[model samples]
Target: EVETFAFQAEIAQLMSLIINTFYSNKEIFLRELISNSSDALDKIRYESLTDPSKLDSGKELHINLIPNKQDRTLTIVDTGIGMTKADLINNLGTIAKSGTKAFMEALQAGADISMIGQFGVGFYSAYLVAEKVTVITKHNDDEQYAWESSAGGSFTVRTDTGEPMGRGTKVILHLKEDQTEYLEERRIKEIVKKHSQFIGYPITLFVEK
Candidate 1:
């Protein structure tokens, strides 16, 4: 079963701004996504400090960039704190209402929560390069769920029964025709070097030979 929901008014407008006005700088999409992934990793690490069980036992903290030329898609996967169904609705379905911020506040009062993607709209930048974006995520306390959107003012979220995932989020971007450049190893490596060279987590790009 799946449920479809309309993007909040603010989110709809923001998507338009990002897709049209930000066309020239489409590479930023990778930077934005990696930044978000880093934050998720940080959150999970922070939580685990208080409760060791919060951390996935054997999963190392890292990110993976996988590009499939046959499918013309680029996938970014992070072994970080994934989202719940309600989180998919509030975080991705709305703008400015950041669930990260709320979570931080609830966890530690007055703690500095400055992080990349405070606006809660960085995820929509996927539309600049992808005709469709699919997010498969699993939170420790919730079942795995898939969130898909085409940047057409609405999106759908459904329980993902295909494969059970460990705690993390996987973002698959179905690249637009012109955005196929991102599917190349050299191009992706260049972008990562330029924008995310100093990111704390280890980022590995999968090379399919």
Candidate 2:
């Protein structure tokens, strides 16, 4: 039999602050995600410095933004350190807070979600613009797996027996009915140029012409 997990009661509170009440506008959703991609790349690079094997043998470090207008989905793929199933749970479900009061105060203040921690489920900010979010990733120690959620209440993680990613992660955002503007290449370029142009890794934008 298969087993399932549920988010602790506190995670429900965190999601309410991040998904429903956070992000005053749309631009932040892109900014925080790119910030995370950049951070992921930085982590792998640092690890590779000490252990050359930390680098994936053939995959170069880069980021890709693919927009699918037909399906109204935007995918951000990165050749960076990917996560294992446990990572998905710890990173996504646990809200790291020094204290409950401080966490609530920051959320109530419209504090930047990306500033919470190095990579503390800041990805949840994607829920600000997307109806469903899927994260497919591969780590050296673990096979590819997918973590998905609608941020409605719970999330699930399972093995991905699909295509191999070599190594790294992919974030797929299923845009909400009112958020189709993100499906345009021009808009994506503009968003990156304004927010992530200087990020260390090369960012490639892929869209149908």
Candidate 3:
């Protein structure tokens, strides 16, 4: 079954600001995504400290960047702590109301409240270059779910019945026509080197032949 949710008023406003006015560097969209994936990987590592079973059996912790020129799509896949359906709604759908703000407060107070950073707003930055965004995620405690949006007023979340995501999240950005530069391996490597070169996990970019 599929469920659709409207973007909260504050979130809608924030989305417009980020997509149309906030970011001057479009390439930072790639940086924001890689940073978010790093946070997810960090979460799984932290969780595994207390519960070793939280770690996926044999999946190494890393991020993969796949760019398909023919499809005009760039996918960022992370083998990390994925989100549940409620997490998709609360974290993505209602960012301005909760999560991000609370997380900031918790950080200020020095609390270890999992490793999800400023994800909601940063996730929308995908719209800076993508016409559509699809997120497939799997949490250890929940079934896999897919969240999709066009940066409109609303987004959808549904159980994903395709191949199991195994563990972690995969974000697919369908690039806008003028933003196809992101589909080039050279450009992607340049951006990674400039912004996310020191990220903790290995970020592997699929080199197209």
Candidate 4:
């Protein structure tokens, strides 16, 4: 039997903030996501260099951005270390822990979300733009899993419907009506250089146009 546990008890406010902050600069949502991808690519590259087999089915450190204007869908794919089930709740759910309260206090005291503590949920920011966010991730040590949410407390995660990524994850955003700016190449590039120029990974951002 595997051991199981739950997060701390203070994450309720953090979770609520993430869901209600769509009024923030919606453009920042794209920037935050791309920055996250860069971090993943960097991690995979570091691991692969130490053990080449770490690359497995994903041999490159890169980012792929796909946009569908008609469907208002945008996908940011990457080959990086994927996450597990517990990871889904902790990484994407309410991150309630020792520092969680301080993090919330700072925000309530006028700290901008961008300048706030890193303890809260970063991926949950996707709720700002997508009605239904789907995350298809494949971890090297486990089978793939897909997690979906609408910024609500009840998120659903299931087994992958296809072959595992062999090394990473793919996050697809079903964009809301006001969030289509991320579907543009120029818009994405501007945000990349602004937020991810210093990242240590070699990133390749794609566009359909």
Better of 2 and 4 by TM-score: 2
Q: Could you give candidate 3's per-residue lDDT for residues 89-165 as a string of tens digits?
A: 87542345665455446546864322223534567668788989999999888898999988778889999999787
Report the C-alpha lDDT of model 4 over 150-206, residue by residue, as the tens digit.
Answer: 654456777776765776778889988877888887887887787777766665665
What TM-score would each prediction reach against the true structure?
0.86, 0.87, 0.85, 0.82
Model 3 stretches with alpha carbons more than 4 Å out: 22-24, 93-95, 98-120
Candidates 1 and 3: which is better by TM-score? 1
Let me know the TM-score candidate 4 reaches against the reference structure: 0.82
- Candidate 1 Cα errors over 4 Å, as ranges: 93-118
Candidate 1's error at 115, in angstroms? 14
RMSD for all candidates, in order, please.
Answer: 6.6, 2.7, 5.6, 3.8
Q: At residue 32, what lDDT does model 2 achieve?
A: 75
| Deviating ranges (above 4 Å) for candidate 4 | 1-12, 92-100
Candidate 4 global lDDT? 0.68
Best candidate, lDDT: 1
Full candidate order by lDDT, most accurate first: 1, 3, 2, 4
1-118 in candidate 1: lDDT tens per residue? 8899997765676566556652366787899899889988998999888998887533579999999999898999998989989989985434444543453454356422122245
- The count of residue-pair clashes in candidate 4 stands at 0
What does candidate 2's lDDT look like per residue over 1-209, in tens digits?
A: 22246655666566677666635566667877887788777878888888888875434888998998888899999888888777877754234433334556775686556554333556766877888889999877788888888766677888888888987889999999988888887888888998787899999998596
For candidate 3, the C-alpha RMSD (Å) to the true structure equals 5.6
Q: Mark the 10 consecutive residues where model 4 has the least summed lDDT.
A: 1-10
